[PDB]
C-alpha cells in the first residue's frame, strides 16, 4: 500500500539536453563538498550517464585520469578521493571510468589485481577493504573489476560462487551475508556476479523474477523490498536484475517509464529519487540507465551487469551471457 501518488503536473517527457547540462556543470557547493567520500563513484556516475547520452566529450578526460592515478595507493587499491582510504567500491568505479576512456594503464593493473586477490576470505567472500566488512556487494565489485581487466582467474572463483549462493534466500533473492534478508540492491550485485562467473543456471528465475516484479507499485515505480516506498534507483536495481535473469517483461514498462520521467526536475535538470525531490548524479545515472533498458531510443544501450554502455563492453570483449 505504501506508495507515492504522482501529481498530474509531473514531467512526462525526456529532458535529455537539461540532464547533460546538469552533469556537465556538476562540481562547480554544499552537497558536493560533503560527498567527497564517494567522489570516484560520483565521477563514474557522471561520466557514464554522459556517455549513454553521447555527451562524454563535454567532460574532462585529462583531469580525471590524473585524479584517478593520484587515488591509487601502494597496496594497489583505489580511494574515493585524494587522502581517503582504498576500497573495492572505488577501485571498481576507477576501473569502470578507465574502461570508458580506454586508459586502463593509467593505473598499475597488476597491483589492482593483487589488491582484489588479497581481500578474498577462506569461505570465498570479499571484504571491502582491510577492515574486513563482508558484503556480497564486494563479491560483485571484485569480479566486475577483474572481468574488466581480463583477470577473473586471479581469484578463487568456485569459492566465491559458493559464498554468493550461500546468500540465496527462501524467496529466490539475496542479502548482504548468509542469512540476510533479500534486498534489490544485493539481488542486483549477486545476479550481476552470477552473470560474470557464468552461474545464472543456479538462480531460480521464476521465483526471484516474481519477487522482483512484485516490487512494482500502483504508481509504476519499483521499491527495493516489501512494504517500502518506490524510487528511481531501486527501479534500476530491480529492472537490471530482471533483465539478467530474463524476466524484464514481468513488469509494466509503460507505468515504470512514467514514474521515472516524473522524477526529473524540469528546471534544474537531473533526476531525484522520487517526484519533486532534490536531484543528484546518482539517481540521474539510474533513471537514464533504467529508461535505456526499457528501450528508449535517445539513450545508448546499457549493460544491466556493469551499468556501462554496451559498446564499451563490446570493445573490451566482456559481455556475459544473460538468462534470456
Amino acid at each position: 500500500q505504501k506508495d507515492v501518488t504522482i501529481k498530474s503536473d509531473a514531467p512526462d517527457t525526456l529532458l535529455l539536453e537539461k540532464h547533460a547540462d546538469y552533469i556537465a556543470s556538476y562540481g562547480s557547493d554544499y552537497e558536493y563538498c560533503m560527498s567527497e567520500y564517494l567522489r570516484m563513484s560520483g565521477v563514474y556516475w557522471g561520466l557514464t550517464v554522459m556517455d549513454l547520452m553521447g555527451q562524454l566529450h563535454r567532460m574532462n578526460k585529462e583531469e580525471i585520469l590524473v585524479f584517478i592515478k593520484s587515488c591509487q595507493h601502494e597496496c594497489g587499491g583505489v580511494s574515493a578521493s585524494i587522502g581517503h582510504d582504498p576500497h573495492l567500491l572505488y577501485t571498481l568505479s576507477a576501473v569502470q571510468i578507465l574502461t570508458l576512456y580506454d586508459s586502463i594503464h593509467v593505473i598499475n593493473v597488476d597491483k589492482v589485481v593483487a589488491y582484489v586477490q588479497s581481500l578474498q576470505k577462506e569461505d570465498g567472500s570479499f571484504a571491502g577493504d582491510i577492515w574486513g566488512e563482508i558484503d556480497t556487494r564486494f563479491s560483485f565489485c571484485a569480479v566486475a573489476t577483474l572481468a574488466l581487466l581480463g583477470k577473473l582467474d586471479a581469484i578463487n572463483v568456485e569459492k566465491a560462487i559458493e559464498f554468493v549462493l550461500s546468500c540465496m534466500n527462501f524467496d529466490g533473492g539475496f542479502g548482504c551475508r548468509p542469512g540476510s534478508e533479500s534486498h534489490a540492491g544485493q539481488i542486483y550485485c549477486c545476479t550481476g556476479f552470477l552473470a560474470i562467473t557464468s552461474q545464472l543456471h543456479q538462480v531460480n528465475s521464476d521465483l526471484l523474477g516474481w519477487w522482483l516484479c512484485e516490487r512494482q507499485l500502483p504508481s509504476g515505480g519499483l521499491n527495493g523490498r516489501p512494504e517500502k516506498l518506490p524510487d528511481v534507483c531501486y527501479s534500476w536495481w530491480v529492472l537490471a536484475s530482471l533483465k539478467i535473469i530474463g524476466r524484464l517483461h514481468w513488469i509494466d514498462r509503460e507505468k515504470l517509464r512514467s514514474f521515472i520521467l516524473a522524477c526529473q526536475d524540469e528546471e534544474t535538470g537531473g533526476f531525484a529519487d522520487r517526484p519533486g525531490d532534490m536531484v543528484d548524479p546518482f539517481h540521474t545515472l539510474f533513471g537514464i540507465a533504467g529508461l535505456s533498458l526499457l528501450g528508449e531510443e535517445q539513450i545508448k544501450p546499457v549493460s544491466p551487469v556493469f551499468c556501462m554502455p554496451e559498446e564499451v563492453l563490446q570493445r573490451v570483449n566482456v559481455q556475459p551471457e544473460l538468462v534470456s
Binding site: 577492515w131 516489501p226 509494466d252
Partner: protein
Amino acid sequence: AEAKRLEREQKLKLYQSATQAVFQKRQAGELDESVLELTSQILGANPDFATLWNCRREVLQHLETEKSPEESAALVKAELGFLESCLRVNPKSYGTWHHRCWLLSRLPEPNWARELELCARFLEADERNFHCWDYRRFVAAQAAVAPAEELAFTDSLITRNFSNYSSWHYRSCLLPQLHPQPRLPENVLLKELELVQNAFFTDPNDQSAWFYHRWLLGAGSGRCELSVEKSTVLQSELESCKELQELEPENKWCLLTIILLMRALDPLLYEKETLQYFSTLKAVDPMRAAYLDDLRSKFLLENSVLKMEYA
C-alpha cells in the same frame, strides 16, 4: 531562510576544517585522542565518511599498545556510547554498524547479552532495519545462542504488529537449522502453515505472510505423497481463501494462493478452476499479467506431462 540556509555554510567550514585537521594529524603520525574528538564531530552527522571510521580504528589500535588494561577498557566503553549515539541519529549506516562489530570482535570478554538487547531495542524502533537484524545474527553466533531461542524471539515479533517480512525471513533460516539435513519435517511444516495462515487471515493485505506461505507450499514432500492430515489442512486453506475472496474480491494474494493450493492438491482435477482463477487474478492485478501468463503456461506444460504419463 537567511538564518538556517546560511547556518550550514558555517557548519560546512567546521566540517571542512575538522576534516583538514584529521588528515593533517594522520599524515603526522599523531594517533591520539584529539583525532577521536575531531572525528566524533564529523561522524555524528556524516557516518558514511568511511575513512574517518578507519582513523578511529587506527587510533584505538595504537592507544591499546601504550595504555593500561583499565585505560583501554575505558576507551572501549566510550566507543560503545559514541556508537550508540551515532546509531540513534542514523540507524542505517553500514559504517557505524561495522565499526561496532569490529569493536566487539576484538574485546576479550564482550557482553553479548547486552548487545542482544541493543538489537531488540533498535528492532522495536524499526522492525525492518536489516542492519540491525544482521547485527543480531552476528551477536547470536558470537554468543552461541541456540536456534530455538531466536525462534521464540521471532514469534513474539510476529504477533505484536505488522512489518513482518524480516521476521518471517529469519524464521525461514532458523527452521531448517532446528532440523539440519544435507525440506521441512511435516509436523514442523503443519505448525508453520497454521501460524502463517493465522497471519494472513488476520491481515490479508500484508504480503509477507503470503510470500512465506508460498515457500511452505513447496517445502514439503510432493502431492503424490499427501498425508490425509496435510491433504485436509490444504483443502481447509483452500476453502478459507475462497471465503477471504468473498470479503476482499480485489485481494490478489488470496487468488494467487488459491491457484497454488489447487496445484499442491491435484493439478488435473482442478484444471478448470485454475484456468478460471487465472482470468480473475489477471483482471485484479493487471501489472502482473505477463508473469501470470508465463506461470499459467508453465502449469499447463506440467499438466500435459501428467496427462501423457497416463496408462
